[model samples]
Target: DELYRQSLEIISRYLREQATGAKDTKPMGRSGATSRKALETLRRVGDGVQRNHETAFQGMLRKLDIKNEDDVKSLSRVMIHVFSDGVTNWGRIVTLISFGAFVAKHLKTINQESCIEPLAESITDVLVRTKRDWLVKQRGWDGFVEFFHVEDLEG
Candidate 1:
């Protein structure tokens, strides 16, 4: 309960700061750029979460048998763990990579619900957007493709 409360506070504060642009201090300097980027990353993560919430909720109920109070609390703890991990490692690139892995790991342990497929796809969408928005923008598409060896898929 304590851990959950604290995690909520930390996450809320971070999100509040993002929402108000309170973390930026300056919009013309490097601090502004970093803050903007962090906000973008946060928004992308939020999108992923929103897109998959219903699917994830159903999957949890069916696969995890999460119907009781204790079951709900346990699921809350799992979320706290993932949220805390992301906060502890906080950064656009760092959080995306680690958070994506965390989602993938948990998904694997659950039964293969059809809804789970779209949830996994949402996670992948975040990853692709992260690279396209940040990495590709930093370098060029050519640079990103070469550096990451992103070959065109043969269909």
Candidate 2:
């Protein structure tokens, strides 16, 4: 569980660091996913995500109810039910992590910053529990970094 845990932690960590990286620029800690190259990767992925369209992301992501403390665990399980299925490739993995960040933006807007960690942990937990073997095969973030390496801004 160590490598995969670290991998999803980095994946989830990137989203949390960049959750606000989409706008407001700073506030959240950049603690772990703090290297220069890792920052660049987030920018590339953020830009790529934005290019896809913002309208669709927020509305769908908003319906996720992590703010209700009682529902955090169950809601995450429900999410894994929907998202963890048919996720046999890198695209799905990145989308899940990216949306996890976008959901962070939603929490900021709703004044629910308190639940951000729960939501973020839910992200790491859901994937780690459900898709672990696949993650191991993906070679942790070694595969993710290989797939999403970015040296420049223009993607």
Candidate 3:
């Protein structure tokens, strides 16, 4: 239990560093928001880890009569991965909606007080392409490759 707490602290500190715009060792052809996006992604992932830590460590320890840290760590990792995928999926949906609003506001030619279908569709189209490109090229790929291994994976 003490070790787990220490590991959790270490991971939390690492996550905070990542979120605080720590420099990356690898180079990639990307835009400015990449670091910010990664921070957001890590924030989401860390939330999952925190939740699963509670569920697996707190809940399972009570129900399964297990007090071993190794077992808890293994289960927590699985739960965290599953929860992280969910977070990423939900994040993408929200991002699409947010980006759509951004596009609709910019692409619409004045006097229009309503959402345009053509513009929305175009925005969605562009967003889908951009999302696909980012998923394959982003740092998250190193982790996502296990969760998703399909070629040209589409939302």
Candidate 1 lDDT: 0.38
Query: lDDT rank, highest first?
Result: 2, 1, 3
Q: For model 3, how does the per-residue alpha-carbon lDDT over 1-155 read when each residue is reduced to its tens digit?
A: 32223222322333324333354444322332443343345445544554544444445334533223333234333333433235345345333333323323332333232333433333333333334445444433343323333457689
List model 2 lDDT by residue over 1-155, tens digit each: 56544644565556556555543344323333433344456557765875595777766755664465565556576667778867567777666767767767666777776666777688777777888788778765556666777457786
* Alpha-carbon local distance difference test for all models: 0.38, 0.63, 0.37
Model with the higher lDDT, candidate 1 or 3: 1
Candidate 1 lDDT tens digits, 1-155: 32223222323323334334355343422233433443444455544653556475446446655333344335434443444334222244334333433333344455332323343334333434333344335543223223434357999
RMSD of each: 14.1, 4.7, 19.9
lDDT computed for candidate 2? 0.63
Report model 1's TM-score to 2 decimal places: 0.26
- TM-scores of all predicted structures: 0.26, 0.72, 0.23
Candidate 1 regions exceeding 4 Å error are: 1-91, 113-117, 127-133, 140-155
TM-score order, best first, reads 2, 1, 3
* Clash totals in order: 0, 0, 0
Best prediction by TM-score: 2
